[PDB]
């Protein structure tokens, strides 16, 4: 999509070419270590529920 | 309590789902596949009592 926009910017047969959508953003991933959770004897279902 | 009778009826009156011998995936060399049946449902008053 970015490459296509780059091509369309210099085309001269299109007055304006834009992309409809939302921009990419930062996401935070929490990585539940499952064996560490098992060491505490905590069901993964409980963690998911909380 | 009234929940115990319901639970007991569900447990005892349960429809089993038996499979089949030599059901795919099956080991090489077999020549016989036979259905397997089992009835976990009660059909008579003496069975329910």
């Amino acid at each position: 999509q970015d490459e296509l926009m780059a091509m369309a910017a210099k085309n001269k047969k299109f007055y304006m070419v834009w992309n409809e959508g939302l921009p990419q953003g930062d996401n935070i991933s929490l990585k539940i270590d499952r064996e560490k959770l098992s060491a505490l004897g905590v069901k993964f279902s409980d963690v998911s529920d909380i | 309590s009234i929940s115990d009778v319901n639970n007991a009826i569900r447990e005892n009156n349960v429809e089993i789902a038996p499979g089949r011998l030599g059901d795919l995936p099956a080991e090489k060399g077999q020549l016989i596949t036979i259905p397997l049946s089992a009835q976990g449902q009660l059909s008579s008053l003496e069975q329910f009592k």
Binding site: R34, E35, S38 | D23, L24, P25
Partner: protein, 49 residues
């Protein structure tokens, strides 16, 4: 890597030990031979009229 608890020794046991986990087929009911070479196929059935 799923974990179970063995009461006999009270030990953590990984599922792989007590079973083989494999990406297989959902069901094993059909097979296709195009010209003697196994393959896969789908049959199209027309809508009425």
């Amino acid at each position: 890597n799923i974990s179970l608890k063995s009461k006999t020794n009270g030990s953590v046991i990984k599922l792989s030990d007590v079973a083989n986990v494999e990406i297989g087929s959902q069901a094993y009911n059909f097979a296709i031979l195009e010209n003697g070479k196994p393959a896969t196929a789908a049959a199209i059935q027309l809508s009425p009229g």
